[PDB]
Short mmCIF file of all heavy atoms in Angstrom, two decimals:
data_model
loop_
_atom_site.label_atom_id
_atom_site.label_comp_id
_atom_site.label_asym_id
_atom_site.label_seq_id
_atom_site.Cartn_x
_atom_site.Cartn_y
_atom_site.Cartn_z
N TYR A 1 10.63 -7.37 6.55
CA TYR A 1 10.24 -8.19 7.60
C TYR A 1 11.26 -8.60 8.55
O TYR A 1 10.93 -9.08 9.64
CB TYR A 1 9.27 -9.30 7.03
CG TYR A 1 7.97 -8.77 6.43
CD1 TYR A 1 7.97 -8.34 5.20
CD2 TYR A 1 6.91 -8.55 7.29
CE1 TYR A 1 6.72 -7.86 4.64
CE2 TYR A 1 5.69 -7.96 6.75
CZ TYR A 1 5.66 -7.64 5.40
OH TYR A 1 4.55 -6.98 5.00
N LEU A 2 12.55 -8.29 8.33
CA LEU A 2 13.58 -8.47 9.31
C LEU A 2 13.46 -7.54 10.40
O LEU A 2 13.85 -7.87 11.55
CB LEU A 2 15.00 -8.27 8.66
CG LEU A 2 15.48 -9.28 7.57
CD1 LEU A 2 16.71 -8.60 6.79
CD2 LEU A 2 15.98 -10.58 8.19
N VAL A 3 12.92 -6.36 10.20
CA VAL A 3 12.79 -5.29 11.20
C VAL A 3 11.32 -4.76 11.43
O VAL A 3 11.12 -4.19 12.50
CB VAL A 3 13.64 -4.06 10.95
CG1 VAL A 3 15.20 -4.43 10.92
CG2 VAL A 3 13.33 -3.37 9.53
N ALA A 4 10.43 -5.07 10.48
CA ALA A 4 8.98 -4.58 10.58
C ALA A 4 8.02 -5.73 10.88
O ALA A 4 8.12 -6.75 10.33
CB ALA A 4 8.63 -3.83 9.39
N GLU A 5 7.07 -5.42 11.83
CA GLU A 5 5.94 -6.34 12.22
C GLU A 5 4.77 -6.17 11.14
O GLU A 5 3.99 -7.12 10.96
CB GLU A 5 5.41 -6.03 13.62
CG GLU A 5 4.77 -4.71 13.93
CD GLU A 5 4.34 -4.44 15.35
OE1 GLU A 5 4.64 -5.24 16.29
OE2 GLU A 5 3.66 -3.39 15.48
N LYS A 6 4.75 -5.00 10.46
CA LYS A 6 3.75 -4.71 9.43
C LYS A 6 4.41 -3.76 8.41
O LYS A 6 5.18 -2.83 8.81
CB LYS A 6 2.47 -3.97 10.17
CG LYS A 6 1.32 -3.66 9.23
CD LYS A 6 0.01 -3.20 9.84
CE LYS A 6 0.08 -1.83 10.45
NZ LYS A 6 -1.14 -1.55 11.21
N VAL A 7 4.10 -3.88 7.14
CA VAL A 7 4.63 -3.10 6.06
C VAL A 7 3.49 -2.53 5.37
O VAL A 7 2.52 -3.32 4.82
CB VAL A 7 5.73 -3.77 5.16
CG1 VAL A 7 6.18 -2.83 4.04
CG2 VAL A 7 6.88 -4.31 5.98
N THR A 8 3.41 -1.24 5.12
CA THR A 8 2.31 -0.52 4.37
C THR A 8 2.98 0.15 3.18
O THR A 8 4.02 0.86 3.35
CB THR A 8 1.49 0.52 5.28
OG1 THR A 8 1.05 -0.08 6.46
CG2 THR A 8 0.31 1.02 4.55
N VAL A 9 2.41 -0.17 1.99
CA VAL A 9 3.02 0.39 0.67
C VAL A 9 1.95 1.30 0.18
O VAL A 9 0.90 0.78 -0.27
CB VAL A 9 3.46 -0.72 -0.16
CG1 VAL A 9 4.00 -0.14 -1.50
CG2 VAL A 9 4.61 -1.60 0.45
N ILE A 10 2.23 2.61 0.00
CA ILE A 10 1.39 3.63 -0.66
C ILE A 10 2.02 3.77 -1.95
O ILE A 10 3.21 4.09 -1.92
CB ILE A 10 1.10 4.88 0.16
CG1 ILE A 10 0.92 4.69 1.74
CG2 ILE A 10 -0.08 5.75 -0.39
CD1 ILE A 10 -0.37 3.98 2.28
N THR A 11 1.31 3.71 -3.06
CA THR A 11 1.89 3.86 -4.33
C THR A 11 0.90 4.46 -5.38
O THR A 11 -0.39 4.24 -5.23
CB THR A 11 2.50 2.49 -4.87
OG1 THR A 11 3.28 2.74 -5.95
CG2 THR A 11 1.44 1.43 -5.18
N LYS A 12 1.48 5.23 -6.33
CA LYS A 12 0.75 5.98 -7.32
C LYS A 12 1.62 5.91 -8.69
O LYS A 12 2.77 6.34 -8.77
CB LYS A 12 0.45 7.45 -6.92
CG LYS A 12 -0.16 8.28 -7.91
CD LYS A 12 -1.67 7.88 -8.36
CE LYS A 12 -2.31 8.80 -9.37
NZ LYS A 12 -1.77 8.56 -10.66
N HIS A 13 0.99 5.19 -9.64
CA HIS A 13 1.57 5.00 -10.98
C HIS A 13 0.76 5.94 -11.87
O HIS A 13 -0.44 6.07 -11.64
CB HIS A 13 1.50 3.56 -11.47
CG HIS A 13 2.08 3.21 -12.73
ND1 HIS A 13 1.54 3.56 -13.97
CD2 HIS A 13 3.26 2.60 -12.94
CE1 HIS A 13 2.50 3.11 -14.87
NE2 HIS A 13 3.53 2.53 -14.34
N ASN A 14 1.40 6.49 -12.97
CA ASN A 14 0.70 7.37 -13.98
C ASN A 14 -0.57 6.86 -14.56
O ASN A 14 -1.47 7.61 -14.72
CB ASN A 14 1.68 7.82 -14.96
CG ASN A 14 2.69 8.91 -14.63
OD1 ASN A 14 2.58 9.70 -13.66
ND2 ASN A 14 3.84 8.95 -15.27
N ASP A 15 -0.57 5.45 -14.85
CA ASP A 15 -1.67 4.86 -15.49
C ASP A 15 -2.79 4.22 -14.59
O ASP A 15 -3.67 3.52 -15.08
CB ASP A 15 -1.18 3.72 -16.51
CG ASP A 15 -0.15 4.30 -17.56
OD1 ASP A 15 -0.21 5.43 -17.94
OD2 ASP A 15 0.78 3.45 -17.95
N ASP A 16 -2.66 4.66 -13.33
CA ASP A 16 -3.59 4.11 -12.25
C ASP A 16 -3.86 5.04 -11.09
O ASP A 16 -3.37 6.15 -11.06
CB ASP A 16 -3.12 2.70 -11.76
CG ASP A 16 -4.16 1.71 -11.44
OD1 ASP A 16 -5.31 2.03 -11.18
OD2 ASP A 16 -3.84 0.46 -11.36
N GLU A 17 -4.81 4.59 -10.17
CA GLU A 17 -5.21 5.39 -8.86
C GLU A 17 -4.05 5.16 -7.82
O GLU A 17 -3.14 4.36 -7.96
CB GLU A 17 -6.54 4.83 -8.47
CG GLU A 17 -7.78 5.23 -9.35
CD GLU A 17 -7.93 6.74 -9.62
OE1 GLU A 17 -8.25 7.46 -8.58
OE2 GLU A 17 -7.65 7.24 -10.76
N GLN A 18 -4.28 5.83 -6.67
CA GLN A 18 -3.35 5.73 -5.49
C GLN A 18 -3.93 4.56 -4.64
O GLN A 18 -5.13 4.50 -4.29
CB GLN A 18 -3.30 7.00 -4.72
CG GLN A 18 -2.19 7.02 -3.75
CD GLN A 18 -1.89 8.43 -3.13
OE1 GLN A 18 -1.47 9.32 -3.91
NE2 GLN A 18 -2.17 8.64 -1.87
N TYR A 19 -3.01 3.57 -4.39
CA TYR A 19 -3.39 2.34 -3.64
C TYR A 19 -2.49 2.24 -2.39
O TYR A 19 -1.45 2.58 -2.34
CB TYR A 19 -3.35 1.07 -4.47
CG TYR A 19 -4.20 1.09 -5.71
CD1 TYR A 19 -3.74 1.37 -6.96
CD2 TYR A 19 -5.55 0.67 -5.56
CE1 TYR A 19 -4.52 1.35 -8.07
CE2 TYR A 19 -6.36 0.62 -6.70
CZ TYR A 19 -5.90 0.99 -7.97
OH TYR A 19 -6.71 0.90 -9.01
N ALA A 20 -3.10 1.45 -1.39
CA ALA A 20 -2.47 1.15 -0.11
C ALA A 20 -2.47 -0.38 -0.06
O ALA A 20 -3.51 -1.03 0.02
CB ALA A 20 -3.11 1.78 1.01
N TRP A 21 -1.32 -0.97 -0.07
CA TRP A 21 -0.95 -2.46 0.08
C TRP A 21 -0.58 -2.58 1.52
O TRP A 21 0.14 -1.74 1.99
CB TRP A 21 0.14 -2.88 -0.85
CG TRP A 21 0.60 -4.31 -0.81
CD1 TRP A 21 0.29 -5.36 -1.59
CD2 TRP A 21 1.55 -4.87 0.17
NE1 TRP A 21 0.99 -6.46 -1.26
CE2 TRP A 21 1.67 -6.19 -0.11
CE3 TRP A 21 2.23 -4.34 1.24
CZ2 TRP A 21 2.56 -7.08 0.56
CZ3 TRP A 21 3.14 -5.15 2.06
CH2 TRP A 21 3.25 -6.51 1.71
N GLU A 22 -0.99 -3.66 2.22
CA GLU A 22 -0.58 -3.81 3.59
C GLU A 22 -0.51 -5.25 3.95
O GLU A 22 -1.35 -6.01 3.50
CB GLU A 22 -1.51 -3.09 4.65
CG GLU A 22 -0.98 -2.85 5.98
CD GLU A 22 -1.89 -1.98 6.82
OE1 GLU A 22 -2.87 -2.37 7.32
OE2 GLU A 22 -1.54 -0.78 6.90
N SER A 23 0.47 -5.75 4.86
CA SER A 23 0.63 -6.99 5.30
C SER A 23 1.46 -7.11 6.62
O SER A 23 2.51 -6.53 6.69
CB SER A 23 1.23 -7.95 4.33
OG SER A 23 1.18 -9.34 4.83
N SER A 24 0.98 -7.93 7.60
CA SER A 24 1.69 -8.29 8.82
C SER A 24 2.03 -9.72 8.74
O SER A 24 2.16 -10.43 9.84
CB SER A 24 0.70 -8.09 9.98
OG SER A 24 0.38 -6.68 10.14
N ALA A 25 2.32 -10.23 7.51
CA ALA A 25 2.49 -11.61 7.02
C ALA A 25 1.32 -12.50 7.43
O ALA A 25 0.14 -12.04 7.22
CB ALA A 25 3.89 -12.16 7.67
N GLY A 26 1.56 -13.67 8.00
CA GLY A 26 0.45 -14.64 8.37
C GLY A 26 -0.32 -15.21 7.14
O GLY A 26 -1.49 -15.67 7.28
N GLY A 27 0.30 -15.04 5.87
CA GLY A 27 -0.19 -15.51 4.66
C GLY A 27 -1.17 -14.71 3.83
O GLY A 27 -1.66 -15.16 2.81
N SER A 28 -1.48 -13.43 4.36
CA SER A 28 -2.36 -12.52 3.68
C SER A 28 -1.92 -11.11 3.52
O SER A 28 -1.03 -10.63 4.43
CB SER A 28 -3.75 -12.61 4.28
OG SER A 28 -3.81 -11.95 5.56
N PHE A 29 -2.44 -10.33 2.55
CA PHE A 29 -2.15 -8.94 2.25
C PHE A 29 -3.50 -8.29 1.84
O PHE A 29 -4.39 -8.99 1.31
CB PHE A 29 -1.04 -8.71 1.25
CG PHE A 29 -1.34 -9.12 -0.17
CD1 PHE A 29 -1.87 -8.25 -1.09
CD2 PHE A 29 -0.97 -10.44 -0.62
CE1 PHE A 29 -2.07 -8.65 -2.49
CE2 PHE A 29 -1.17 -10.79 -1.98
CZ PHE A 29 -1.78 -9.82 -2.82
N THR A 30 -3.58 -6.98 2.14
CA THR A 30 -4.78 -6.23 1.80
C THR A 30 -4.44 -5.10 0.80
O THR A 30 -3.19 -4.58 0.78
CB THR A 30 -5.49 -5.57 3.00
OG1 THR A 30 -4.65 -4.64 3.54
CG2 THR A 30 -5.94 -6.59 4.03
N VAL A 31 -5.34 -4.75 -0.13
CA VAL A 31 -5.19 -3.74 -1.10
C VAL A 31 -6.47 -2.90 -1.07
O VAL A 31 -7.58 -3.49 -1.02
CB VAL A 31 -4.83 -4.22 -2.63
CG1 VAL A 31 -4.76 -3.03 -3.62
CG2 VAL A 31 -3.51 -4.99 -2.60
N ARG A 32 -6.41 -1.61 -0.94
CA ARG A 32 -7.46 -0.67 -0.87
C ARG A 32 -7.09 0.64 -1.66
O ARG A 32 -5.79 0.96 -1.78
CB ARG A 32 -7.89 -0.38 0.53
CG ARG A 32 -7.00 0.57 1.42
CD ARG A 32 -7.29 0.62 2.90
NE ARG A 32 -6.74 -0.64 3.52
CZ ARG A 32 -6.86 -0.98 4.90
NH1 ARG A 32 -7.58 -0.12 5.61
NH2 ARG A 32 -6.28 -2.02 5.35
N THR A 33 -8.04 1.37 -2.15
CA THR A 33 -7.79 2.67 -2.82
C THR A 33 -7.43 3.60 -1.65
O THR A 33 -8.17 3.58 -0.62
CB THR A 33 -9.01 3.19 -3.58
OG1 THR A 33 -10.15 3.25 -2.72
CG2 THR A 33 -9.36 2.24 -4.84
N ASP A 34 -6.31 4.37 -1.75
CA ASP A 34 -5.85 5.18 -0.68
C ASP A 34 -6.66 6.57 -0.62
O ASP A 34 -6.89 7.18 -1.66
CB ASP A 34 -4.32 5.47 -0.74
CG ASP A 34 -3.74 6.19 0.42
OD1 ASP A 34 -3.92 5.63 1.57
OD2 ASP A 34 -3.11 7.24 0.33
N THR A 35 -7.01 6.90 0.68
CA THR A 35 -7.81 8.15 0.95
C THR A 35 -6.93 9.28 1.53
O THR A 35 -7.40 10.47 1.63
CB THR A 35 -9.00 7.84 1.96
OG1 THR A 35 -8.44 7.16 3.16
CG2 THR A 35 -10.12 6.96 1.28
N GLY A 36 -5.66 8.99 1.91
CA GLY A 36 -4.75 9.87 2.43
C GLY A 36 -4.26 10.97 1.52
O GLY A 36 -4.83 11.26 0.39
N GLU A 37 -3.16 11.72 1.90
CA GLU A 37 -2.48 12.73 1.08
C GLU A 37 -2.04 12.30 -0.32
O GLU A 37 -1.33 11.32 -0.39
CB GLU A 37 -1.29 13.31 1.95
CG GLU A 37 -0.82 14.79 1.44
CD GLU A 37 -1.72 15.87 1.58
OE1 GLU A 37 -2.28 16.13 2.56
OE2 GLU A 37 -1.96 16.52 0.52
N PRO A 38 -2.50 12.95 -1.39
CA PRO A 38 -2.13 12.53 -2.70
C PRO A 38 -0.64 12.75 -2.94
O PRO A 38 -0.14 13.75 -2.53
CB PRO A 38 -2.93 13.54 -3.74
CG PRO A 38 -4.05 13.97 -2.88
CD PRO A 38 -3.42 14.17 -1.53
N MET A 39 0.06 11.74 -3.57
CA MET A 39 1.43 11.70 -3.83
C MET A 39 2.02 12.26 -5.05
O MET A 39 3.24 12.54 -5.14
CB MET A 39 1.89 10.19 -3.72
CG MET A 39 1.86 9.55 -2.34
SD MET A 39 2.08 7.81 -2.40
CE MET A 39 3.83 7.68 -2.88
N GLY A 40 1.17 12.32 -6.13
CA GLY A 40 1.61 12.73 -7.48
C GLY A 40 1.99 11.58 -8.24
O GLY A 40 1.27 11.12 -9.12
#
């Protein structure tokens, strides 16, 4: 957040699905199942 207005985190763990975490600060963050390119 020193350089970014918004941070998107796409992540895939072996024991779970691919998720997209996102926040532009302001006290809240979003989590959704990711529809984009599978990461492995």
Side-chain angles (χ1 to χ4, degrees):
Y1 290 91
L2 290 165
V3 297
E5 65 180 7
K6 185 170 74 187
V7 181
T8 309
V9 178
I10 318 291
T11 194
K12 179 67 181 75
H13 187 284
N14 284 332
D15 305 329
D16 217 338
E17 291 302 292
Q18 193 164 295
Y19 300 98
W21 176 102
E22 194 172 81
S23 184
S24 297
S28 73
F29 69 91
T30 68
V31 179
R32 74 193 81 184
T33 56
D34 191 55
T35 57
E37 196 61 56
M39 286 171 74

